[model samples]
Target: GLRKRLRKFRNKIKEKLKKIGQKIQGLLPKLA
Candidate 1:
């Protein structure tokens, strides 16, 4: 149970990171 819960939390963090990466990429064209 603990491993499963940790995995879920890690996946959530990874998804959030990916979303932020996409958002940052969206702003790059203007700055570049």
Candidate 2:
């Protein structure tokens, strides 16, 4: 279903954003 696919895609994007945010945080001295 297109709605299911969109939900999955949104979940994937949320996971990707969390990972990217972690990586960015690691680059910050205070966060690292």
Candidate 3:
């Protein structure tokens, strides 16, 4: 049960980071 919860938490963080990465990528072209 604890492991499952940990895995879920990590996945949520991973998803957030992915979204942030996409946002940064979208901004990169404007700077270039």
Q: Give the TM-score of each candidate.
A: 0.59, 0.57, 0.58
Which numbered prediction scores highest in TM-score against the true structure? 1
Worst 10 residues of 1 by lDDT: 15-24
Q: Evaluate residue 30 in candidate 3 and report its C-alpha lDDT on the 0 to 100 scale.
A: 100
Candidate 2 lDDT score at position 1: 94
lDDT of 3 by residue, 1-32 (tens): 99999999999999889888998898899996
Residue-level lDDT tens digits of model 2 in 1-32 = 99999999999889878888887777798765
Cα miss at 4, model 1 (Å)?
1.6
What global local distance difference test value does model 2 have? 0.86
lDDT of 1 by residue, 1-32 (tens): 99999989999899889888999898899997
Error at 6, model 2, angstroms:
0.5
Candidate 3 vs. truth: CA RMSD?
1.5
Ranking by TM-score: 1, 3, 2
Model 3 off-target regions past 4 Å?
A: none
> lDDT of each structure?
0.90, 0.86, 0.91
Worst 10 residues of 3 by lDDT: 18-27
